[PDB]
Symmetry: C3
Subunit: 350 residues, 3 copies
């Protein structure tokens, strides 16, 4: 009971205890804590679970993610960006995403040690871009989200491109052939297995076991996040079916990571939870899937993956709408927390 | 005399009378009224005339435009976006443009009933994007314009693309051949006929009779709008000649719809009318044509038409310039009306 | 001594004296003064030196730059944009860049007299876009930089493209072949000669003598600008080596003009000079080189050069970061001057 409360939420007691210890242990929390905040979680335990899932899939990707997030945190410190924001991990999840997605899309092969240096440089530059986006987005009271990650990875990726001698990348070509979609060949087992692999694809992992581990991590923190995550993956696969995407893309979960993230964000994290806000989250996740198709097709010309760009665009657009009803209530950015605490704050204010 | 005044302008008396009647009649005004406000008109009569022109050209396109605008209005209501703004049609013209331009560019053929569903979804999502753009553009006191339409249609279009099984689109390929322009083959009859078809191309109509019907609708509302519209089409065709565009493009009016809209906007709608503002409108329409060429070439790589994107970019840029003279006077967005009333307000203030 | 002080800085005494003379002499200062403010200099003498360097390389390019900047100044006057800002040359450097880079990339051949007309139109439109960007960027207290130049040249360029009958352009194709980089074939003489040609490439000049002339002009104004300029070119060539760019590109200086400009801007012009700000300038120039590779690859699909786009993006991002230390101090835009005067102001305030 008490222990379950302790391991839930943002882990506040652990937070004070870690305050006392040496700078080195702390940097570990701040990196474990920021590892799991891609999915809007401030739980170090869940972050360790996320890391375990990364190790399970591929050791090289996990090592790159770890080094990227640790160097993003170190860069946030050296720049004196903020304390209490770095300590909550707001500067590390961009770094881990940059490292992981640089390791995923690199054609140089596994254990290519020279990949660390661009990884280091991109991850260190993440706090700079995060502060730059925070300066712009603070006028409208909007969060940075995953935009630094997108900007930095897209740079490495286009800069170098597939035809590079030192840091080659994977081929991304625009579609130029009519993909006949034999509906009788659809497999329902993989179609429903697209739910865990879809949530696992947030970090580039396409292993159903890693997706299940990520779902376990989300459930440990807050069941509401888990529910919105699984419903986001479901609407992502449904939209992929509706837009005649190849069945392999749906099975791999390429249509689900933007939707799961967008449903987590709008439904419980930044909008106070309500049935109206729940349908807003579902509509936002559908629009995020459809815009994800659009973005993936647009970015294919340059030779780049869609990444988390659709999620940012949809989440910002929804987070910006103004309404004449009191049910859809945007929370002030200073008082945003895990969705249960946000609902508690909404109840206390009302 | 009195009747002519009644059918002119924004139609204010009709506006109060319609206030009383059932919600269903009202939704019809609000859709008729918003049909004609692509060209910045609040006249239901003109909207009916615009609809008649659409029916004249192609029944399928007109049906798609009608359903798109009605569902945009319904979505504005269900979201409680605003009343008095929905009642003026500020949320319907984006919907009708989305529906019409989805029907125009769809390669599935006429009377393809499955086209309604993406049409419904895009049109319903128009108020969301309109509010999102209004949140950003209200800081600088700028209007949303046709930006939601552009964003939503470009999404459907790229998402799906030509190589799609369910919702195929038309081919748009970048130019890769030297187009020899035999100046002796120019036809002056079609060159001057490019004026009505250019204004008709605002809705995707390339019929000279439909363009003339649209010009009649504009004249019914306000002669100043008609004058700026025809001069915008003229500068569009002149710029198309100056940039060595193929003569067929000029004849079809592909070079005129952005210019006519931009000249209508800057000259009388948002800047108080003056000879200085008139030359500003002409320069804005020339820049809009030249940027329209640029945008049409840029978007051709992705497989998308230029759409109304050039108009938005030019109009915003001009609406943002700051000046040290009192002749170019930007009106406050709350007190914008038909250009005659705007000039009356300018005279009353001065 | 006194004369050296007179020819240094912003040339203030000359500034008052020129105030009295006829409008025609003045327009010459305001064009000479704005010619050299691409590199953030308000010295007419240096501007004449910049012009001499342009003449040295190619007469046609220099003539186009002169006419572009004079028409940008005339357009700033006719629009009543500002006095004291036009008199300082804030509206002319965009014009000279537009003219020079239109003359450089035009495939019609030297002394193609019809190139003046698009040159005139783009250069006259530069104050409009400059005011539009100033309206947006004044909220965050940020400068327009070279953005109007980029927007206007990219328009001419895409609009027309290589396959145009009247205004053909040069081929820019995306890389599709594996460039084997024989490290033994590197030449150190040209590798170090990439420093002056890199700074000369700011205006499109790829002559080492013209680069040296530009360096002399920078030294005349302020030695700090010269130091940051040469270190920016050095980091540009180093980054070009690190990203496996073809050695010819590094030798020509295609990797240095964005970095030299960004190091000049962040290090001394807009951030008060400090060792912390100096390392910030070096990091900004490295990020500017790497983003320059990214942008050059992205824009290659449309058929356009990278231009000064990377510089703008990097400079704005760095100029937007918020920090918790007092060493990195962003100056108010009203009180920005040559870096020596900025350091003097910083010392006086502190």
């Amino acid at each position: 009971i008490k222990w379950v409360s302790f391991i839930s939420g943002d882990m506040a007691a652990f937070g004070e205890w870690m305050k006392g210890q040496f700078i080195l242990l702390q940097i570990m929390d701040w990196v474990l804590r920021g590892a799991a905040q891609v999915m809007f979680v401030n739980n170090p335990l869940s972050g360790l679970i996320i890391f375990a899932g990364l190790i399970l899939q591929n050791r090289w990707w996990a090592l790159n993610g770890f080094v990227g997030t640790v160097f993003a945190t170190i860069s946030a410190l050296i720049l004196c960006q903020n304390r209490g924001a770095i300590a909550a991990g707001l500067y590390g999840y961009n770094g881990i995403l940059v490292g992981l997605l640089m390791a995923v899309f690199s054609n140089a092969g596994d254990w290519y040690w020279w990949l660390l240096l661009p990884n280091i440089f991109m991850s260190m530059a993440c706090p700079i871009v995060s502060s730059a986006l925070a300066s712009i987005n603070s006028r409208w009271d909007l969060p940075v989200f995953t935009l630094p990650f997108n900007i930095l990875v897209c740079l490495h990726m286009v800069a170098t491109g597939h035809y590079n001698q030192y840091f080659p990348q994977i081929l991304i070509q625009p579609t130029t052939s009519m993909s006949n979609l034999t509906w009788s060949e659809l497999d329902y087992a993989q179609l429903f297995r697209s739910i865990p692999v879809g949530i696992g694809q947030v970090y580039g992992c396409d292993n159903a076991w890693t997706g299940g581990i990520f779902m376990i991590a989300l459930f440990i923190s807050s069941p509401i996040t888990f529910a919105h995550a699984t419903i986001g993956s479901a609407v992502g696969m449904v939209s992929g079916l509706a837009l005649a995407a190849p069945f392999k893309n749906i099975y791999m979960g390429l249509w689900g990571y933007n939707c799961v993230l967008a449903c987590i964000a709008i439904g419980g994290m930044f909008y106070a939870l309500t049935w109206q806000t729940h349908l807003l989250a579902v509509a936002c996740a559908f629009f995020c899937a459809y815009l994800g198709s659009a973005i993936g097709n647009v970015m294919s010309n340059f030779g780049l993956p869609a990444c988390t760009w659709p999620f940012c665009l949809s989440a910002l657009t929804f987070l910006l709408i103004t309404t004449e009803t009191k049910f859809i209530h945007k929370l002030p950015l200073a008082k945003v927390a895990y969705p249960e605490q946000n609902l508690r704050y909404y109840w206390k204010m009302k």
